[PDB]
Design a protein around this ligand. Structure first.
Ligand SMILES: [Cl-]
Ligand code: NI
Length: 185
């Protein structure tokens, strides 16, 4: 009620802008448009129809027949995570993403998240490599929690992407949405 655990718990919030495409590609950088590029689409066109545990999620980004990628760099200090706190406490940095594909074509997904120093030094890294998206159209979560990452972390670089497995014109690639980065104690 006055301790750091309480405050970090209270200030926990997604630090990624525009996680679902409500603002199109706004807030996303190093946007790479492989094939026909990224396209924001709405939930239930139907199919497998899952997106459970969060009904606020209405849209997703769909990738095409060559890699579509996009990234965001989060300034932890600017969001109020004190340099001293980051350096000695190294509080949990939790990154999550949701991906799915179509039932009429396979697709691939990849996530790379890095903790960077003030000068873009790569201090920590989580990387999925290329991942087979579920054939049945279901949404899959990926989650990684960075701990014990050492001093000097200032930025979180979140990068993800998708492509189809069929090389077809249109948007048959991996779909991504509800991406998150937050700090917890
Ligand atoms: Cl949140
Ligand atoms: Ni307290």
């Amino acid at each position: 009620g006055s301790h750091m655990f309480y405050f970090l718990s209270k200030r926990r919030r997604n630090l990624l802008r525009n996680p679902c495409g409500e603002e199109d590609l706004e807030g996303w950088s190093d946007v790479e448009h492989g094939g026909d590029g990224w396209k924001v689409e709405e939930l239930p066109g139907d199919g497998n129809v899952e997106f459970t545990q969060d009904d606020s999620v209405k849209k997703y980004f769909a990738s095409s027949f060559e890699w579509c990628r996009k990234a965001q760099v989060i300034d932890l200090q600017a969001e109020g995570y004190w340099e001293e706190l980051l350096d000695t406490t190294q509080p949990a940095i939790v990154v999550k993403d949701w991906y799915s594909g179509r039932t009429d074509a396979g697709s691939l997904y990849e996530l790379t998240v890095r903790l960077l120093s003030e000068n873009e030094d790569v201090l920590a890294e989580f990387a999925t490599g290329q991942v087979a998206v579920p054939e049945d159209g279901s949404w899959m979560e990926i989650s990684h929690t960075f701990i014990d990452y050492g001093p000097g972390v200032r930025f979180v670089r979140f990068e993800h992407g998708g492509q189809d497995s069929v090389y077809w014109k249109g948007w048959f690639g991996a779909r991504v949405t509800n991406s998150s980065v937050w700090v917890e104690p």
